[PDB]
Amino acid sequence: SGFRKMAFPSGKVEGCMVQVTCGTTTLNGLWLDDVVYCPRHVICTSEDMLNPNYEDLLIRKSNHNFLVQAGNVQLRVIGHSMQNCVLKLKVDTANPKTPKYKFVRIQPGQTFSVLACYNGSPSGVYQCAMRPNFTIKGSFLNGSCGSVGFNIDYDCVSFCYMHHMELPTGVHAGTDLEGNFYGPFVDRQTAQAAGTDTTITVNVLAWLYAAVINGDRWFLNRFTTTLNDFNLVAMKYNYEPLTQDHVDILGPLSAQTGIAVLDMCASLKELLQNGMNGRTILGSALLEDEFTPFDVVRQCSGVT
Ligand SMILES: *C(=N)[C@H](C[C@@H]1CCNC1=O)NC(=O)[C@@H]1[C@@H]2[C@H](CN1C(=O)[C@@H](NC(=O)C(F)(F)Cl)C(C)(C)C)[C@@H]1C=C[C@H]2C1
């Protein structure tokens, strides 16, 4: 029993981290096969960040300007290309630690593990959700650029995020591994703000099911509700609309506990309208929305 925010084991991604240097800028790269992926603002200096034309800046860059370092050992760059907001540096050695992998673009509400890195070396690992406003509530300093977000399916690492930047509210923005930003953000030092940070309703419900599984069920009331009637209440508290797809995805948890999704919705409804009254659910004084239904199942059934 017990329920914790849990990252995937990071060993397979640690073997892919390298340091990339160009000019005075040092940041992290991801080395998979004979390619290093990193954020394109490696090309920029402190002057350039206001309004850089990345294509023009790239004209002045040769292969030998890019120093790539795995541990103490240097990798020879034999080619470079810009793909959207990432740079692909072709090197002459394939990574011997390349795990089984693919690049996925995740959906909002889905979660992943972040291996926060500085100078190509790991600082630590934590779990994040892609917020509905396409930001993440991370922990990143200067130098963290190129740190990656991933999930693991048995042996296959799915890379979903590369870190690029921090927004005014202390939240973070980045790209998929094809260099496309999540959200409307650009890799430019200009006025940018996150939209309204809404709660991932289906995840809250998943977490309530986790609470019940762990014996922490004081919040279960005697009411039920309808999907439309719950959704009216959701809208008021900036909760995302609950759909029938979300109901179906909660089915495994509903079946294990014997509590229908709409019964749980009615208990959530009461927590929204009355608050928690100083009480906790799984050691938390607020409602947690960064556990997917799949996250809950995995932790409660001991998937490896
Ligand atoms: C990468 N090393 C670094 C990570 C940042 C630094 C502090 N916390 C982080 O996560 N990235 C940057 O410095 C990027 C960089 C610059 C400016 N920038 C920012 O994150 C800046 N933010 C913004 O401009 C904003 F999000 F739009 Cl408000 C700032 C935090 C330094 C003010 C250009 C924009 C993105 C890349 C190029």
Say what the resolution is, in angstroms.
2.0
Note if 145 is an active site residue: yes
**Are 168 and 234 found together in one domain?**
no
| Same domain, residue pair 204 and 294 | yes
Residue 89 to residue 28: CA distance in whole angstroms: 12
Q: Are residues 76 and 213 in the same domain?
A: no
The Cα–Cα gap between 264 and 87 comes to 46
Non-local (6+) Cβ contacts of 232 within 8 A are none
Determine whether the shortest distance from the Cβ of 235 to ligand 1 is under 6 A. no
Structural domain span for residue 9? 1-14+100-197
Residue nearest to atom 16 of ligand 1 (CA): 189
Residues 34 and 95 in one domain: yes
| Residue linked to tokens 């509210």 | 169
Q: What are phi and psi of 256, to 5 degrees?
A: -65, -50
Structural domain count, the chain: 3
Name which of 187, 207, 166, 197 is nearest 300 in CA terms.
207
- Counting from 1 in the atom list of ligand 1, the atom nearest the Cα of 143 is 2
Mutate to test the pocket of ligand 1, among 45, 123, 165 (most ligand atoms within 8 A of CB): 165
Q: What is d(CA 112, CA 161) in angstroms, rounded to the nearest whole number?
A: 9
The structure was resolved experimentally with: X-ray
Instruction: Decide: 111 and 290 in contact? Cβ < 8 Å.
Output: yes
**Residue 212 contacts residue 5 (beta carbons within 8 Å):** no
Q: Exactly one of 145, 164, 172, 246 is catalytic; name it.
A: 145
Q: Is 41 annotated in the active site?
A: yes
The answer to whether residues 60 and 91 belong to one domain is yes
Q: Are residues 55 and 179 in the same domain?
A: no
Q: How far is the CA of 164 from the centre of ligand 1 (A)?
A: 7
Chain breaks in the chain (C to N over 2.5 A) after: none
Domain end point (choices 174, 197, 220): 197
Helix/strand/coil (H, E, C) string of 84-121? CCEEEEEECCCCCCCCCEEECCCCCCCEEEEEEEECCE
Cα–Cα dist 127/295, whole Å: 11
Query: Which of 153, 171, 197 is the last residue in one of the domains?
Result: 197
d(CA 49, CA 41): 8
For residues 8 and 56, membership in a common domain is answered with no
Provide the CATH number for the domain around residue 5: 2.40.10.10
Find the DSSP H helices in 30-79: 54-59
SS3 293: helix
Q: Are 278 and 189 a contacting pair, CB within 8 Å?
A: no
* Ligand 1 lined by 85 (C-beta under 6 Å): no
Do 136 and 92 share a structural domain? no
User: Which residues make Cβ contacts (< 8 Å) with residue 158, sequence separation at least 6?
Assistant: 101, 102, 103, 104, 150, 151, 152
Q: Which one from 16, 22, 38, 41 is the annotated catalytic residue?
A: 41
Same domain, 187 and 286: no
- The distance of Cα 303 from the centroid of its chain, to the nearest Å, equals 20
- Burial class, 26, CB count within 10 angstroms (exposed 0-12 / middle 13-18 / buried 19+): middle
End-to-end alpha-carbon separation of the chain, Å? 17
Pocket test for ligand 1, best of 40, 87, 126, 166 (most atoms within 8 A of CB): 166
State if residue 48 touches ligand 1 by the CB under 6 angstroms criterion. Answer: no
Q: Are residues 145 and 214 in the same domain?
A: no
